[PDB]
Amino acid sequence: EPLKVEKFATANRGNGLRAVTPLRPGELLFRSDPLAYTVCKGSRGVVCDRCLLGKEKLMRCSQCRVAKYCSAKCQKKAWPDHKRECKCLKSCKPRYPPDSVRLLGRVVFKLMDGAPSESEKLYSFYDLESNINKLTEDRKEGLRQLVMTFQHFMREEIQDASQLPPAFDLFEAFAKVICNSFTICNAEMQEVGVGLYPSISLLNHSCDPNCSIVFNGPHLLLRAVRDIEVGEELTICYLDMLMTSEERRKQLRDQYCFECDCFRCQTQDKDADMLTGDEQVWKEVQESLKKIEELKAHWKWEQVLAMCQAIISSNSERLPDINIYQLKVLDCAMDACINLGLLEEALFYGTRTMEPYRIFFPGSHPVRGVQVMKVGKLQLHQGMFPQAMKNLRLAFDIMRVTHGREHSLIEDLILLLEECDANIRAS
Ligand SMILES: CCCCNC(=O)c1ccc2c(c1)NC(=O)C[C@H](C)N2C(=O)c1ccccc1F
Ligand SMILES: C[S@@+](CC[C@H](N)C(=O)[O-])C[C@H]1O[C@@H](n2cnc3c(N)ncnc32)[C@H](O)[C@@H]1O
Ligand SMILES: [Zn+2]
Ligand SMILES: [Zn+2]
Ligand SMILES: [Zn+2]
């Protein structure tokens, strides 16, 4: 069709997107490649720099020796967007720049040297929100340091403003990046990358949204996850669902410079359940998760598992599985076990997440769709067919809404459903 969405000017939250026509759950609203993107710090050399797929088979750029790739095709295609950054990268090894700086380098190369980008159809990098009049002095110091890091990293390819676009202010561009960066997760919901998607950046936040985004490599799909009326603002949740209203407050302040007075934030919706169990215990668990989550972002599965087991099967006092810190521990342990092939133990943690995930991810949410598929997949390969089929159908009922036929993972689920169904049919 023409578009199901259009940019408009909201009353109190700058620009927004709104429905042009009524929308149903699962309808594809928009799709976009990035303006610019980069692999994350902790997944560097663990995933293809370009398609963001994992492998043990990864060849690597001998020029800079920082880029890794899954294929000759991926190395070659990533050359135009990695030609200019190439020199700068080698030229500063091994104190590597923060992701935000590498990301902005690619933005600049792309605005200088690229044709207009399809990702900027509804809204461009130039139009993005900076919140400059809301930034705290502490935030500004932080952005100054990013500007100086950028001028250093980029010295070879960029010495002055004629090499940057028309009047382009680097302080403002980092301001834009802070509140318009998308985290790119792979099919298994692990963080692998960071990109800008300027048309998608019109979406304002809601702690109970009507839309969802999902990624297939660097490609982004925006889908409705509820019914939406003509004229209704389109929204997505910018944050992890496993957070309390206080945690959301801090993050929405610090990164996005706004205050949320939605129903959930006004009522502290779910907050008491999330923090059930003994406070001294969940305090330490939340402390240890810093490290467990760091190890995870670096794919260090045996170490993740060791630390999770010391919590889950601790000799000292334990937490309910509905406690968010406990829950995040169980999830990391599950993922560790999957990636280490300890499938019975993976299933044990996975099944325990099921009921909390039902509660903390209401309606249709891609994170729940994927977790349910994962558990269903584990059961399937232990011959637990009736319980598998149950979970695979549930995953399909979520992911037909959240991922849809345009996302290749749905094809994988379809194969699992046909397999499980074969088994039952014959039994
Ligand atoms: C510019 C304003 C948008 C900021 N937000 C996002 O970029 C975003 C949020 C949540 C995401 C993703 C991206 N990425 C995905 O692949 C979808 C899944 C649902 N999702 C996560 O699970 C997630 C949860 C908390 C932290 C980071 C995460 F990636
Ligand atoms: C990705 S942008 C969203 C588009 C933005 N409103 C614009 O005008 O370009 C993120 C910024 O939008 C604003 N924003 C998003 N959700 C909001 C909300 N629920 N209430 C108020 N402001 C919000 C904040 O300025 C935030 O830093
Ligand atoms: Zn690749
Ligand atoms: Zn290179
Ligand atoms: Zn809220």
Task: Report which of 128, 174, 134 is spatially closest to residue 15, judged by C-alpha positions.
Answer: 128
* Cβ-contact 389, 421 below 8 angstroms: yes
Neighbouring CB atoms inside 10 A of 306's CB total: 14
Number of residues that make up the chain? 427
Tell me if 20 CB under 6 Å of ligand 1.
no
Domain of residue 84: give its range.
47-95
The whole-angstrom separation of Cα 272 and Cα 79 is 51
Are 288 and 323 in a shared domain? yes
C-alpha 151/C-alpha 108 separation (Å) is 12
Enter the tokens of residue 427.
């039994």
Q: Sheet holding 211-216: strands in order across? A: 28-32, 219-224, 211-216
Atom of ligand 1 nearest to the CA of 191: 29
Whether residue 192 has its Cβ less than 6 Å from ligand 1: no
Establish whether 204 is an annotated binding residue: yes
Instruction: Assess whether 186 and 219 both reside in one domain.
Output: yes
CATH number at residue 123: 1.10.220.160
Bridge partners of residue 18, in order along the sequence = 6, 233
CATH number at residue 219: 2.170.270.10
CB neighbours of 21 closer than 8 A, spacing ≥ 6?
4, 230
The 3-state secondary structure of the chain, one letter per residue: CCCCEEEEECCCCCEEEEECCCECCCCEEEEECCCEEEECHHHECCECCCCCCECCCCEECCCCCCCEECCHHHHHHCCHHHHHHHHHHHCCCCCCCCHHHHHHHHHHHHHHHCCCCHHHCCCCHHHCCCCHHHCCHHHHHHHHHHHHHHHHHCCCCCCCCCCCCCCCCHHHHHHHHHHHCEEEECCCCCEEEEEECCCHHHCEECCCCCEEEEEECCEEEEEECCCECCCCEEEECCCCCCCCHHHHHHHHHHHHCCCCCCHHHHHCCCHHHHCCCCHHHHHHHHHHHHHHHHHHHCCCHHHHHHHHHHHHCCCCCCCCCCCHHHHHHHHHHHHHHHHCCCHHHHHHHHHHHHHHHHHHCCCCCHHHHHHHHHHHHHHHCCCCHHHHHHHHHHHHHHHHHHCCCCCHHHHHHHHHHHHHHHHHHHC
- Answer yes or no: do 66 and 130 share one domain: no
> Residues 122, 78: one domain?
no
Asked if 313 and 292 sit in the same domain, the reply is: yes
38 and 117, same domain (yes or no): no
At which of 78, 95, 112 does a domain end?
A: 95
Of the ligands numbered here, which is closest to the C-alpha atom of 67? 4
- Please tell me the distance between residue 95's alpha carbon and the centre of ligand 4 in angstroms: 16
Provide the number of structural domains found in the chain. Answer: 5
How many Cα atoms within 13 Å fall on the side-chain side of residue 194? 20
Ligand 2 surroundings by CB, under 6 angstroms: 13-15, 128-129, 131, 179-180, 201-202, 204-205, 256-258, 260
Residues 324 and 295 in one domain: yes
Q: For residue 128, how many C-alpha atoms fall within 13 Å in the half-sphere facing its CB?
A: 25
Quick check: 399 and 360 in contact, CB under 8 A?
no
Beta carbons of 330 and 312 less than 8 angstroms apart: yes
Interacting residues of 336 by C-beta distance below 8 A, sequence separation 6+: 296, 301, 302, 304, 305, 308
The Cα–Cα gap between 77 and 113 comes to 15
The angle at the Cα of 365, spanning 362 to 367, to the nearest 5 degrees, equals: 115
Residue with tokens 């490609």: 219
Phi and psi based region of residue 189 (left: phi greater than 0; alpha: psi -120 to 50; beta: remaining): left
Identify residue 332 by its one-letter amino acid code: C
Q: Which of 95, 130, 160 is the last residue of a domain?
A: 95
Instruction: Out of 214, 238, 272, pick the residue that ends a domain.
Output: 272
Taking the CA of residue 12 as reference, the ligand 2 atom at the shortest distance is 21
Q: Are residues 54 and 34 in the same domain?
A: no
* Angle formed at CA 56 by CA 153 and CA 368, multiple of 5 degrees: 85
CA atoms within a 13 Å half-sphere pointing along the CA-CB vector of 186:
19
Q: Is 93 left (phi over 0), alpha (psi -120 to 50) or beta?
A: beta
User: Resolution reached, in Å?
Assistant: 2.0
Q: Tell me the C-alpha to C-alpha distance, in Å, between residue 411 and each of 132, 370, 371, 385, 399.
A: 44, 13, 16, 19, 11
Write the CATH number for 66: 6.10.140.2220
If phi > 0 it is left, if psi is from -120 to 50 it is alpha, else beta; for residue 65 that is left
How many C-beta neighbours within 10 Å does residue 91 have? 14
Method for structure elucidation: X-ray
| Protein residues near ligand 3, an ion, with CB under 5 A | 48, 50-51, 70, 74
CATH number at residue 416: 1.25.40.10
Alpha carbon distances (Å) from 412 to 140, 193, 218: 46, 22, 19
Distance CA 376, CA 413 (A): 10
265 in the same domain as 190: yes
Q: Do 148 and 192 lie in a common domain? A: no
- Answer whether 357 contacts ligand 1 (Cβ < 6 A): no
Same domain assignment for residues 7 and 82: no
Do 141 and 196 share a domain, yes or no? no
Residue nearest to atom 16 of ligand 1 (CA): 185
Under 8 Å between Cβ of 418 and 393: no
**CATH number of the CATH domain containing 283:** 1.25.40.970
Residue position matching structure tokens 């990035």: 34
Strand partners, 222: 30, 213
The structure tokens listed for 146 are 């990013």
